[PDB]
Design a protein around this ligand. Structure first.
Ligand SMILES: Nc1ncnc2c1ncn2[C@@H]1O[C@H](COP(=O)(O)OP(=O)(O)O)[C@@H](O)[C@H]1O
Ligand SMILES: Cc1c(C(=O)NS(=O)(=O)C2CC2)cc(-c2ccc(Cl)cc2)c2cc[nH]c12
Ligand SMILES: O=C(O)[C@@H]1CCCC[C@H]1C(=O)O
Ligand SMILES: [Mg+2]
Ligand SMILES: [Mg+2]
Length: 258
């Protein structure tokens, strides 16, 4: 409400969103570089997602953690909603994975620790992110992971692209809690080591079946300790999924995390 578009110089697009685009921007008085996530009112209204968005703002604005992207504020005009975000200068984990094909165990373990810590803080406030995926994981100036895109975040317990990161309970439209993010963590650990998520398929229908069945195999290069942690996280039964305390203390994480 205090901020308006006239307060910012707009730079290049940083990435595209479902309901608009994110741009690099600079606040005129302070010269503060930040990111402006621009969303079109007509598209949000058509999707009936105005309430979710109010919630993305409300949830993210109260989070304060070095591995969680900051949301400084918002404003809106006749056609758009603007979220004022911390700029993540090293881009997405998505792009790094495309470039490198797969990460080594040390880079994987480090990212998994940073994510587990950010998720521990979230779950302490009963906040479920629910959209943990590489395009929503950004990199700070020191290459540290930052959980971003709280677009689908909710307070636990609750109801609501590809299904690749979604657990069975969310896929079936059943009730879910914080355990959904533990499943996504297992999908991500596999994807970082293998280069593709474990339930990846040509069609949505084939992916749905693979998730429902928890039907996946590891390539031979995946180590025993990596197989153990992934297998523990990818449990059909949410209750069976470990606590984040356990993920951080896991022998493969403690041995490879930097
Ligand atoms: N703060 C940021 N700094 C740098 N790039 C960003 C930032 N926020 C978003 N992006 C880029 O824009 C993309 C879309 O942003 P995101 O918040 O995930 O939107 P959506 O909810 O539409 O998926 C990201 O995947 C990333 O490439
Ligand atoms: C129509 C309208 C308004 C709205 O109240 N607009 S107004 O000021 O009454 C009118 C002169 C423009 C507000 C929002 C909105 C703003 C901030 C957040 Cl975080 C979430 C939602 C949305 C989203 C889609 N449509 C919206
Ligand atoms: O921030 C957004 O673009 C949206 C807000 C409304 C719910 C869906 C959400 C998304 O992240 O896709
Ligand atoms: Mg996103
Ligand atoms: Mg989103």
């Amino acid at each position: 409400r205090q901020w308006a578009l006239e307060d910012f110089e707009i730079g290049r697009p940083l990435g595209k969103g479902k309901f608009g685009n994110v741009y690099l921007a600079r606040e005129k008085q302070s010269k503060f570089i930040l990111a402006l996530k621009v969303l079109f009112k007509a598209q949000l209204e058509k999707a009936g997602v105005e309430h979710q968005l109010r919630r993305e703002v409300e949830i993210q604005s109260h989070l304060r953690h070095p591995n969680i992207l900051r949301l400084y504020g918002y404003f809106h005009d006749a056609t758009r909603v603007y979220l004022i975000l911390e700029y993540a200068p090293l881009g997405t984990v998505y792009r790094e994975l495309q470039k490198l094909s797969k990460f080594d165990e040390q880079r994987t373990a480090t990212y998994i620790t940073e994510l587990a810590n950010a998720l521990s803080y979230c779950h302490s406030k009963r906040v479920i992110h629910r959209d943990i995926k590489p395009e929503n994981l950004l990199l700070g100036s020191a290459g540290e992971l930052k959980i971003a895109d709280f677009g689908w975040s909710v307070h636990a317990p609750s109801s609501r692209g590809t299904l690749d990161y979604l657990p069975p309970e969310m896929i079936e439209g059943r009730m879910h809690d914080e355990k959904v993010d533990l499943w996504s963590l297992g999908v991500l650990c596999y994807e970082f080591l293998v280069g593709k998520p474990p339930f990846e398929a040509n069609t949505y229908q084939e992916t749905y079946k693979r998730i429902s069945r928890v039907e996946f195999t590891f390539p031979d290069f995946v180590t025993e300790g990596a197989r153990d942690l992934i297998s523990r996280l990818l449990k059909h039964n949410p209750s069976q999924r470990p606590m984040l305390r356990e993920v951080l203390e896991h022998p493969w994480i403690t041995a490879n995390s930097s």
